[PDB]
Swiss-Prot record, chain B:
Component of the RNA polymerase II (Pol II) complex consisting of 12 subunits. Interacts with DEF1; the interaction is direct and serves to bridge RPB1 to the Elongin complex in a DNA-damaged dependent manner. Interacts with the Elongin subunit ELA1. Interacts with the Elongin subunit ELC1. Interacts with ASK10. Interacts with ESS1. Interacts with RTT103. Interacts with SHE2. DNA-dependent RNA polymerase catalyzes the transcription of DNA into RNA using the four ribonucleoside triphosphates as substrates. Largest and catalytic component of RNA polymerase II which synthesizes mRNA precursors and many functional non-coding RNAs. Forms the polymerase active center together with the second largest subunit. Pol II is the central component of the basal RNA polymerase II transcription machinery. During a transcription cycle, Pol II, general transcription factors and the Mediator complex assemble as the preinitiation complex (PIC) at the promoter. Residues 24-33 are annotated as: Lid loop. This is DNA-directed RNA polymerase II subunit RPB1.
Length: 49, 53
RNA sequence: AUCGAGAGGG
DNA sequence: ACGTCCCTCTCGA
């Protein structure tokens, strides 16, 4: 079917940015443990809370 | 207070030595903790004065 | 690993 | 006198 609304359409220049979800995701349930505070540890890097 | 906070004890005669968990060491062969080094400096600053007097 | 400084992300 | 919450990187004793 057609669309009762027409659509504005052209080639706008876009750009990839440096944020990938797979680079951002992270999970943790028990895991690495700091030594003076005995709590979890900081960041996706060191895989923590 | 008659037991929990005498005033006479805002003067430190004996000193509490906190244990390793307060001031651990980490393998960097090791390497003690800011509060460890400081207390040797106190036990070096004390001794010298122990004998002077 | 620890502290110190630095750029970005909503 | 303390001076918004969290998060991802990168680098010098």
């Amino acid at each position: 079917k057609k669309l009762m609304a027409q659509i504005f359409f052209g080639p706008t220049y876009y750009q990839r940015l440096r944020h990938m979800v797979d680079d951002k995701i992270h999970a943790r349930a028990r895991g690495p443990m700091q030594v003076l505070t005995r709590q979890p540890v900081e960041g996706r890097s060191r895989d923590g809370g | 207070n008659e037991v929990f906070s005498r005033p006479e004890w805002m003067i430190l005669t004996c000193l509490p030595v906190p244990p390793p968990p307060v001031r651990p060491s980490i393998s960097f062969q090791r390497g003690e903790d800011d509060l460890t080094f400081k207390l040797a400096d106190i036990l070096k600053a004390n001794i010298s004065l122990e004998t002077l007097e």
